[PDB]
Amino acid sequence: LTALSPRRFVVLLIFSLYSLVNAFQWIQYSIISNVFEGFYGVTLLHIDWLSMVYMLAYVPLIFPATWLLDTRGLRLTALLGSGLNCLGAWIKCGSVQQHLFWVTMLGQCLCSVAQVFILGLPSRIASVWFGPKEVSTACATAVLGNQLGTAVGFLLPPVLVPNTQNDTNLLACNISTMFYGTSAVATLLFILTAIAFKEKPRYPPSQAQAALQDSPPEEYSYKKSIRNLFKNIPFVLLLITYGIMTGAFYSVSTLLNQMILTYYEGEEVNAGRIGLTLVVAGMVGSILCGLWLDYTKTYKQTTLIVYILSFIGMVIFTFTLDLRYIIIVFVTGGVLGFFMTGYLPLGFEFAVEITYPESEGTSSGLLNASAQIFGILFTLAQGKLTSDYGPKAGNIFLCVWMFIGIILTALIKSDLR
Numbered sequence: 001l002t003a004l005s006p007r008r009f010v011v012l013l014i015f016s017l018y019s020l021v022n023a024f025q026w027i028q029y030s031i032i033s034n035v036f037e038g039f040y041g042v043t044l045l046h047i048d049w050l051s052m053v054y055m056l057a058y059v060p061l062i063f064p065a066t067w068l069l070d071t072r073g074l075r076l077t078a079l080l081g082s083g084l085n086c087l088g089a090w091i092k093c094g095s096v097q098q099h100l101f102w103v104t105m106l107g108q109c110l111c112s113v114a115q116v117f118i119l120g121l122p123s124r125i126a127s128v129w130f131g132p133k134e135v136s137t138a139c140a141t142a143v144l145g146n147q148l149g150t151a152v153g154f155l156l157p158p159v160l161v162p163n164t165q166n167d168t169n170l171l172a173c174n175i176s177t178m179f180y181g182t183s184a185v186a187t188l189l190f191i192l193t194a195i196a197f198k199e200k201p202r203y204p205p206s207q208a209q210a211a212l213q214d215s216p217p218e219e220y221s222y223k224k225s226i227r228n229l230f231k232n233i234p235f236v237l238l239l240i241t242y243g244i245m246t247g248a249f250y251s252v253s254t255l256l257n258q259m260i261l262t263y264y265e266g267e268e269v270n271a272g273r274i275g276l277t278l279v280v281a282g283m284v285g286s287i288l289c290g291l292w293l294d295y296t297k298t299y300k301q302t303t304l305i306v307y308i309l310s311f312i313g314m315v316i317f318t319f320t321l322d323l324r325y326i327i328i329v330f331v332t333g334g335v336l337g338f339f340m341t342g343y344l345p346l347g348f349e350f351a352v353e354i355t356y357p358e359s360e361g362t363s364s365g366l367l368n369a370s371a372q373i374f375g376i377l378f379t380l381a382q383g384k385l386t387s388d389y390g391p392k393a394g395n396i397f398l399c400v401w402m403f404i405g406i407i408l409t410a411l412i413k414s415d416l417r
Contacts, residue, residue: 002210005201008129012138014196015125016145018082018189019118023149024156025089025111025182026054029104030254031272032157034261038165039175040101044258048383050108051254055372057112058119062365063222065116070217070361074121074128075199079190081117084110086190089183096176098168119146119368123360132206140290147283147341150253154275158268225362234354235363237408239370242347244405245310247374248398249340251382252278252314254375258383259391260329263321274329278337285342293417299350300414306346307409310339311402318395353416 029036029050036047069077088110095103122142130138161174204210229235253275260271293302313336320332347367355363378398386394 001203002131002205002207003203004131004205005129005203007196007198007201008138008205010196011129011198012125012141014189014192015078015121016142018085018186018193019121019142019146020149020152021089021182021186021189022081022085022111022115022118023146024153025085025092025108026051026115027150027153027253027275028157028178028182029108031154031257031275032161032268033257034268035161035163035165035171035175039098039168039171041098042101044387045383046101046105048254048379050105051250052376052379053105053109054112054115055250055375057109058116058372059369061113061116062120062369063226063362066120066361066365067222069117069120069124070220073199074124075197077117077121078193078197081114081121082186082190082193084114084117086183086186088114089179089186093176093179093183096172096179120361120365122146123364128205128209129201130205132208135206136290140287144283144286147279147286151276151279151283154253154256154279155272158272163266163268220359222362225358226366228358229355229363229366234412234414235351237412238347238351238354239366241307241405241409241412242343242351242367243370243374244401245307245340245343245347246371247376247378248314248402250371250375251378251398252340254379255382255386255394258386259321259394262391263324264326267326270326274333277330277334279341281334281338282341282344285338286345289342289345293346293349298415299346299353299417300412303343303346303350304406304409306339306343307402307406310336310343311399311406313337313339314395314399314402318392318399321391321395350414354414 029047033044033047036042037044040046065077068080088107091107091110092104095101095107097103122139125142126135126138157178160178161171164171164174204213256275256278257268257271260274261268264270289306293299296302313332317329317332317336320328348364351363351367352360378401382394382397385397
């Protein structure tokens with residue numbers, strides 16, 4: 001007896017909404033990083049670390065959290081993901097002062113820990129609550145909810161918080177309003193999670209989950225899985241190319257305010273819409289990419305073409321910022337964003353196919369961990385280059401690294417799909 005419960009829409013909607021808030025909080029500081037420079041009396045390096053602890057905290061905590069999710073259940077991970085997101089947001093609301101940067105540093109640390117319990121959920125929620133035909137779209141919706149958070153995170157903070165650096169009292173009110181609004185939304189979603197997020201439906205929704213429910217997962221071993229994934233060389237190369245592709249997206253998103261503001265002074269609002277275009281277009285590309293793979297070509301050919309086009313994406317983007325035309329940044333940012341974050345569906349689906357005899361829990365974790373490691377290195381490197389030799393030097397650094405990504409992608413041997 002397998003049936004679909006109406007609660008699955010509520011569970012999916014609740015998770016997508018508090019995934020939006022957590023992803024909103026990752027980029028809310030970086031998009032107005034020039035505002036927080038004068039508010040805290042703090043250099044750009046610390047403000048970049050606000051968006052980078054989202055990546056630093058993910059690397060060590062991903063696998064113990066996956067162990068917690070695979071052993072305790074969906075509800076505890078959901079409660080911890082929303083609970084720490086709500087707790088991290090509430091700490092920030094008390095950090096709106098000129099001498100309390102560590103308080104907002106501590107608050108962002110909790111949100112980064114919350115992301116560990118959020119990013120691994122979308123694949124599990126669809127496979128537990130949704131029937132066989134709707135697993136793919138339910139999984140896609142949850143990830144798009146996280147990407148939609150970045151889109152809102154790019155657009156709203158510039159609107160909510162103007163520069164107003166010559167009036168600190170008025171500046172403090174706007175920052176507190178954004179923090180108060182973020183915590184209030186996160187608190188409501190945590191309350192809903194504690195109420196509506198059931199552990200599992202009354203009956204399994206799919207035939208595969210009914211069979212899988214009878215098998216205890218205590219026989220799994222994470223040490224064997226990670227060690228076995230580095231033995232085969234095709235996956236190691238893909239772990240690097242995906243990290244470069246996704247890490248470049250994190251580096252650009254974190255430093256988008258710095259590159260835009262030096263050429264266009266006072267256009268921090270427009271930098272938000274460029275960030276929105278850079279990721280909304282990727283959402284369109286991600287949807288189109290999913291319908292693209294099983295319609296014309298194979299995984300290897302498609303992932304090389306997108307990577308080649310993604311490299312061309314910033315080559316035009318690198319050499320169009322200096323043109324001093326704001327319209328050109330919108331189009332080039334969208335074209336670059338159509339392929340930068342349109343590759344993540346390609347990265348995940350390519351890896352899971354070439355890793356059949358190994359569980360997708362670790363392969364997905366390693367790919368995300370690879371993105372965090374490269375995102376930290378790129379932001380640290382591009383941040384110094386931009387702050388010293390101009391944004392063109394910083395962007396060329398990313399262009400060089402995708403050239404390595406194209407070469408490494410071409411060396412992968414695969415024929416699946």
